Amino acid sequence: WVDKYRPKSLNALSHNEELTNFLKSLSDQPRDLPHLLLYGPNGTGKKTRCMALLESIFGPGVYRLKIDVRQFVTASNRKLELNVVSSPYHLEITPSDMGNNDRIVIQELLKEVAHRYKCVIINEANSLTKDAQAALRRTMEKYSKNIRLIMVCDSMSPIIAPIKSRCLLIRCPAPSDSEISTILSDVVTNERIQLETKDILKRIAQASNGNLRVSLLMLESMALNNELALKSSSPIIKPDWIIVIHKLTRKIVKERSVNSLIECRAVLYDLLAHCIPANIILKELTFSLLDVETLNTTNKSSIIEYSSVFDERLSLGNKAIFHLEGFIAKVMCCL
Amino acid sequence: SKLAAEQSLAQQPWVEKYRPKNLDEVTAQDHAVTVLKKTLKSANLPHMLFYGPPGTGKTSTILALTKELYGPDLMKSRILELNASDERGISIVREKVKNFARLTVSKPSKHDLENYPCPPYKIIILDEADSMTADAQSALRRTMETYSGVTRFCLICNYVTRIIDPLASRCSKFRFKALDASNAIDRLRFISEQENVKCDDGVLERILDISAGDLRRGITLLQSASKGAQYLGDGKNITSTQVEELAGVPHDILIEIVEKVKSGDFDEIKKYVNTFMKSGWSAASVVNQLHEYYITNDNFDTNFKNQISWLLFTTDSRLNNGTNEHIQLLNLLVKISQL
């Protein structure tokens, strides 16, 4: 499991040695530490490295944390309920758990909270609205001797320039396939898995695209199908939704009509109803449609253009299927 | 007293450690500080409106001016500083600002008049005036027009358009220029020598080149490079590559993208984009670097340049809406590869 085997310190990290050394350098003198922003691909291990850095700045009790609740009152009598992850040395807030009320929680909670300082971990800073980021802009500078921010995000694109300047930027590159394979080797020798040939582990990396969280989860999911004994041709158990998307692309390239558009809409509804975001659906659908060797460059260019257009539409809209079906119809018209 | 302040400055980041304390520390904004120094001997300081890019030194300039005017004793008694972290509605502007303006100037001490000019007026500064609503701004009109004998108003903003036209007409407009390599290389070299920052020949000028008219970001990048070079302890000099690595920019990876765009089909470009998106880079920075390279390089046709400019504009406009960076970057590279 991902959680059973996870590093708890900086000396327990097993990839990106230069990043571990940079973190040790940054934690050598912990009091004169500026705000930090960890950015990189999703599933690299930045949330583990931030906790490992806190374990170097403070005692080992940083992992012994508790979940509490705090209530807020907006301009109306709608009560905002937000759970907080707190520790005797730091606290974690995730403003991605609500709508446009991120600014209120951010400003009020950070003002109440504001070695000698208490660390703050802002999870998924990309969901922070521009107004909440503007509110945090001056809170980052006014209280710099009591509150230090460690913002974990996957892309600095939606982060405003003032916030980018107000904190150090630390990039976390995805681990190489070799390091992923070495980690999976230790995991399968500790979990007592049976490997007929080691190269399968490499293939797992080649199916994860640098994601360690996805790699270990897929390894464990396919270890339950092979009954704790992975063979030489164990089927990479691509998440059910990936198989559904692949079948959808097969249906797209096979038949281009309105009767097939109805069943495409039905598949989109069944995918959206099971807690699957539409942006990821569109991304996977487009990327796996470009992989279709039956199409040519003229078709793939139009497909990527329509996918960008409808991605903008979906980012500007709320009825996601209204854009997904339109993109599917435009792709059908292109082919 | 003063020694505690010196130690706190020495244990402070370089942005606040080297904040200009006098009007002479301003390196590039000379046109404004010349007038500010001339009016320091006179007593006809008009209402001022500082505007320009962020990190040009507006707040530092006004702080240094107020210091040189009032001394460290009257610095806390004849100044009303209102930032964006405070409430600045109509009620606040009508009650607090107007009560402070209507009040008389505090009496200077015997030590104040001997060293400082001590003008007969006080200063009310409003930092980040972009967040002020237009009605609360119009409320300040007669407040600053009738009580000008006892108080002077200093507005500070980044976008001069956010301030109403009457207020922009009542105040003298001071535009702070972007701090590029030319007019800030002296300040950057001074900061580097004061901190023993051993770098190469074209590092500092490069840093400001990445800053794009922002001395604060340049000083932060210099501090980060100095920390990264002191942790290693190799005793070598900081390189431009090491600076542009931590600044969010490498040149070789961009040249690889140019080669894949020039020569290559849809499949190779898609594969290289999928590989490049594994290493975390902001798509906005990649688009900006591609734009700089394509527009600056004198090896492409003008017909190609119009199309590359329009495509980069469309890609930036689409990325400014929260779209997926991978899809937009792939679409941009594919569209510019067909050219």
Add this chain to the structure above:
Amino acid sequence: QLPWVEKYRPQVLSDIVGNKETIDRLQQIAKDGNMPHMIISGMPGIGKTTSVHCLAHELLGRSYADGVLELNASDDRGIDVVRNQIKHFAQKKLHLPPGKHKIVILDEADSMTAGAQQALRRTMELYSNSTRFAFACNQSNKIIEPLQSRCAILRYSKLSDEDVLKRLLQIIKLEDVKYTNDGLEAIIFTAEGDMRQAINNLQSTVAGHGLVNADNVFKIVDSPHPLIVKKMLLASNLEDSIQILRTDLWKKGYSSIDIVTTSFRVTKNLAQVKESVRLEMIKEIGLTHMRILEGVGTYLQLASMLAKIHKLNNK
């Protein structure tokens, strides 16, 4: 002199050219009696206050003075007033015909506080056999559901072109005014289902120029120059439309919002061009309106809208 809205204010339910169904309902109620508690909601200037006034007058005859209690938003209508004065009026003894009841007219009921509205429930429930309540508001949602549960709900709608045209023709016949078809059309167009605003604009145009013509109406009540907007959109060359927009609309002080909105109306109601080109022009006009609503309203946006409309018309 008295304005035409007040002078020609209807005093009988037949003179109301509003919603025919509710008007005949109230007429039959006044004819038979037994008026129930009612709440009349709608938009300003469609005949809500006049309707309830006419109903109360016709239902009470000469006893209107001592049987009708009028309370507007200009008077205190808090918890204390509902507790003392409304209750004293409802408990007041009055000999009325065996088909009439005391009427409590409450104008602008959407402005009463929650406490007064809550106290009015039992006040109207215990004296529902000798006192009746008629509320006149613009938003029925502002009145609590318990109060709405004890009364009828009459939702008044906008006045169609025919009704306002008929009322204006009646007023012109009663006043001997010189008019023309295009002038009345422009008046009704600028009224937007508002009968009071229509009569006010008519009286203002009469007292300012004497002749009710579209030019005068678009002059004394100048706002966006619709006919001018139509001539701008129907231009054949881009430079002519640009010069029209610059001189007639932009150089005279017409706001961009009025220009684009008047533009939308002209297009929707256009008949010279086909349906598809009209829909494309509305789409361009719609996008321009969206951009302006975001604060990007300038002359360049309207110029680009006209350019896109011409490109659509450019086959």
Add this chain to the structure above:
Amino acid sequence: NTWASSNKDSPISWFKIVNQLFRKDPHRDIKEQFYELLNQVELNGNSDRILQGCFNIFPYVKYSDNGIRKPANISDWLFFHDLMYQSMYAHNGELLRYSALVPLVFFQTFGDIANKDDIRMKNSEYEQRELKRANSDIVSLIMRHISVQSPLMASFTDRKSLIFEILPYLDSMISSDFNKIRNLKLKQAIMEELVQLLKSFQLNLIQNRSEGFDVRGGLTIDPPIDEVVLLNPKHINEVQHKRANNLSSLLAKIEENR
């Protein structure tokens, strides 16, 4: 047959307007039909419901088809309507006048003489919204359970990663056929790891004894991960039969550990 008084005072059921938007009369001018339909859409004030009706009906309507582009042009309008509808909550409702134009694009594009039969309709969106709410509430409860037990897991789990990556694998692990495993020691070790995973996610095995006289009270997982993960109706039946035998073995092991 009562409808005369309705023609006299009642408008056009939004459903009747949707069926009229797909009909073209060959005997009337297309412009007169368009203005009549515009007035009916405007008088109804419910442009959104009419459009949702048009969106549900258009795939079942007969329309001369060349390459199903007509649907591509209409996705751009529908996207324009969604932007307009979002802006109605942010801005004073001046934009409401353009809402009646989007339904009329269906009359222009898909209106045909072939569409003589009334297509009945339903509200899949309210059911999908209530289902999405229920699934989001289940996921929010699982995320809270992880936050209380797994101190570190909660820092790496986004709501999307939990739905698409973690829950499908967790369910595949619970639904795996333990009857194929001949090695009792390996079966016991896997069952101990699965009991540890059920504990980390706070997944309770409830004996649903809501069975009328039929001697097998089915074991169910609380919260029901099955409703979030199992999109395919064919896989639901296969997984339910396999899970019933696994969950009884897992319950016996949880009781042994208790």
Add this chain to the structure above:
Amino acid sequence: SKENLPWVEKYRPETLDEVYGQNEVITTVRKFVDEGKLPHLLFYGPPGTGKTSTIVALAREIYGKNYSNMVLELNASDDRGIDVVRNQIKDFASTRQIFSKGFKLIILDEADAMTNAAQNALRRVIERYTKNTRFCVLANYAHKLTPALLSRCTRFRFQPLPQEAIERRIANVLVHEKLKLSPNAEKALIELSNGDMRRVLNVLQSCKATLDNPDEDEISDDVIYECCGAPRPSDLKAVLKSILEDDWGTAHYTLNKVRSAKGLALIDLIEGIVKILEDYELQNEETRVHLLTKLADIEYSISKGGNDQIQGSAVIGAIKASFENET
């Protein structure tokens, strides 16, 4: 002393003969007051047209020098609610004057910020007390006033100041001050005013301050353009010329140095180039269509942020590709 007030306040008209630009409404109001029939007035118009000055001079002509006591002047700065109406306005309308005998005047300046309940309560105050008092409502937007309140008053639309009246006021100011103005400078000043006397007075004071001399010289176009701010016409035309004729890299360098030497904004340059190219007599309207569309798209993108360099290159490429069709 009046020498301390700004030029906008110092030159405020005190009599109805000093209000230029508005002639059809000024004469009508003078006739209303001389003949006696003064109805409820509604002065609707843009800012800086002279509505407040007009009504102040009118009240001065009506009541004399004691205007500040016989007139009830309420504005947005004062609390104007429904209770404020009920008490103050009704007590003022129902009672009579304490200084003389005659009708009263209630000047509701900037009444477009009043609450709907306040207007609903006032619309019956105007109709009830109409034999001893009058009402004057000043507005910039006629959509914030209820139609009932809008129908009880006679509407007067204050048109923007034309060329003749604004030049007359400029000549009056140049007579009152030891200042000279060039004819072309005066024309450029009238061009950047849009009928707003406040802007003209403010920039006139500012360019007099810019003179740096004892005012023995004249004020030319250069002074106005350098003082009023905004990309000077010189730099504007230089950038346009370098875009239209010079090379891509040279055009980029010119735009960069122009926008960085004076700290100019890209949106101001865009609007200036749009205004300049409007006079260009061009070929087939396709170039104009492309130019307007691309420039409006770039302006809408700038209105939301982004990369200034990318947007500048986009402007250059859009103008170039639009003009490439003219050949």
